[PDB]
């Protein structure tokens, strides 16, 4: 998919977004000032929809549910944020939100739609012996439009990598039965450079240098648990962009 | 400074390091199998010295102090690490340590020296109202060979950036009186894009979702306190590389 949907009645915001996405990403764009303009829009044509909560024919966020139910991933455009609003949106299945209170916050949308577009073709692997942790991380990576493989043990991870050599990034949990995180990182790096297979080591900063041990064994990066979805997206995106650049 | 010193008696390891550093960095390399061989090397010519603890004439790590006192920054080459071993080193003046138990672990030194070379010409700013955290972060960054400016509050940060436009990366503490970290980030971003001035937001990871707040305000990155030096080095390196390549 090569097209971005924007539904936003502010002439200024809509134009800022079209100009920026057009110039920086070269992606196709449909932009409407009403939910009614976006009526023909189906999920299979758009990477993602950037959706205002203040539309003339949907003044209280109604466009969000409407577009989610047509199969469009949605990123909410918002002037305000709160803990309650964040939780509500994320519960309804919204991918993310973008602050539109300033031009620099609005710029977040531009890097995001470019990232989401590139992610569509990218295979990643989560390796974690905690089902709860594994499923949370997978869900969150799936909301980045990545194709996400799952493994509950290093043995499974190694087997999945052999079967799917398109996987380009692996997130690695530190403590697992038989073969722990650092040990799996050593095994992978005995075969693959940081440019062939990016590795993010999942750590805790309440240990005696787990992140350090990851890096000295050739992990591209670290991420400490517990982590927010916004932290995950930031860290994954960077490492994916390192691979492309 | 564009030269590197290597003092390592393993033929295999020294040659691996020479090959990789010659191939992947623009650095000149002087390598020796004994400390005596490196006698006349002067501190002002070398970016860093990669230093074995097991040398024929310094079998218990004596070469580290010797080269430190010649004004060379030192990265230790070690076959095995403990928490007790990184203990005595960093409190002596070591830049970092590199594991030499495998080819892939050696490769960390390659990336490191390349980055240490590049960091010499790069200016950064630490903004933090806590004296100890501000001083430690400054010390750690200085160990990455960066040129490091400090600010105790947003007002001083801004004045510093005005006086030193070469600064390309700011690390911003969240809790500061009068003007907080997110407010400073907002002011900086009204003028400068993520490509013009990199911003790493430092916070504690709790219920306020501060990391998220930084990112949505245009911070390039986040780092949660408390953090280890390798964590800061990793983060700063990634952001500097982003400015150079993305
Ligand atoms: Mg509106
Ligand atoms: Mg585990
Ligand atoms: Mg030796
Ligand atoms: Mg503070």
UniProtKB/TrEMBL annotation, chain A:
4-aspartylphosphate: residues bearing it: 52, 173
Gene Ontology MF: a single term: metal ion binding
Superkingdom of origin: Bacteria
Positions with a binding annotation for Mg(2+) 2: 129, 173, 175
Cofactor: Mg(2+)
UniProt entry keywords in alphabetical sequence: Metal-binding, Phosphoprotein
Domain Response regulatory: 3-115, 123-240
Catalytic activity: 2 GTP = 3',3'-c-di-GMP + 2 diphosphate
Binding site for Mg(2+) 1: 8-9, 52, 54
Enzyme Commission numbers on file: 2.7.7.65
GO biological process: cell adhesion involved in single-species biofilm formation; negative regulation of bacterial-type flagellum-dependent cell motility; phosphorelay signal transduction system
GO cellular component: plasma membrane
Protein name in UniProt: diguanylate cyclase
Species whose genome carries this gene: Aeromonas salmonicida (strain A449)
Residues of the full protein shown: 2 to 246 of 415
From TrEMBL, chain B:
Record-listed Mg(2+) 1 binding positions: 8-9, 52, 54
Boundaries of the shown chain within the full protein: 2 to 247 of 415
Keywords: Metal-binding, Phosphoprotein
A Gene Ontology cellular-component term: plasma membrane
Record bears the keyword Metal-binding: yes
EC top class, as a word: transferase
Name of the featured protein: diguanylate cyclase
Binding site for Mg(2+) 2: 129, 173, 175
Cofactor: Mg(2+)
Molecular function terms from GO: diguanylate cyclase activity; metal ion binding
Gene Ontology biological process terms from the UniProt entry: cell adhesion involved in single-species biofilm formation; negative regulation of bacterial-type flagellum-dependent cell motility; phosphorelay signal transduction system
EC number(s) reported in the record: 2.7.7.65
Domain Response regulatory: 3-115, 123-240
Modification type 4-aspartylphosphate: residues: 52, 173
């Amino acid at each position: 998919k090569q097209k971005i949907l924007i539904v936003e009645d502010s002439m200024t915001i809509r134009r800022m977004l079209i100009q920026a996405i057009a110039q920086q990403t070269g992606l196709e764009i449909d932009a409407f000032d009403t939910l009614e303009g976006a009526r023909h829009c189906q999920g299979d044509e758009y990477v993602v929809a950037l959706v205002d909560l203040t539309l003339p024919d949907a003044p209280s966020g109604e466009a969000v549910k409407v577009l989610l139910e047509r199969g469009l991933p949605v990123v909410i455009l918002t002037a305000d944020i709160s803990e309650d609003k964040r939780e509500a949106w994320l519960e309804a299945g919204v991918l993310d939100y973008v602050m539109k209170d300033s031009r620099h916050s609005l710029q977040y949308a531009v890097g995001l739609v470019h990232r989401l577009y590139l992610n569509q073709q990218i295979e990643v692997l989560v390796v974690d012996d905690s089902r709860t942790s594994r499923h949370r991380t997978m869900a969150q990576l799936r909301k980045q439009l990545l194709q996400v493989h799952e493994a509950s043990h290093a043995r499974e991870a190694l087997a999945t990598l052999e079967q799917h050599p398109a996987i380009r990034l692996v997130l690695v949990d530190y403590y697992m039965p038989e073969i722990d995180g650092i040990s799996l990182v050593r095994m992978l790096r005995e075969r693959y450079s940081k440019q062939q297979l990016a590795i993010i080591g999942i750590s805790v900063s309440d240990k005696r240098g787990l992140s350090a041990r990851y890096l000295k064994q050739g992990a591209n990066d670290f991420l400490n648990q517990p982590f927010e979805p916004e932290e995950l997206q930031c860290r994954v995106s960077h490492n994916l962009e390192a691979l492309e650049q």
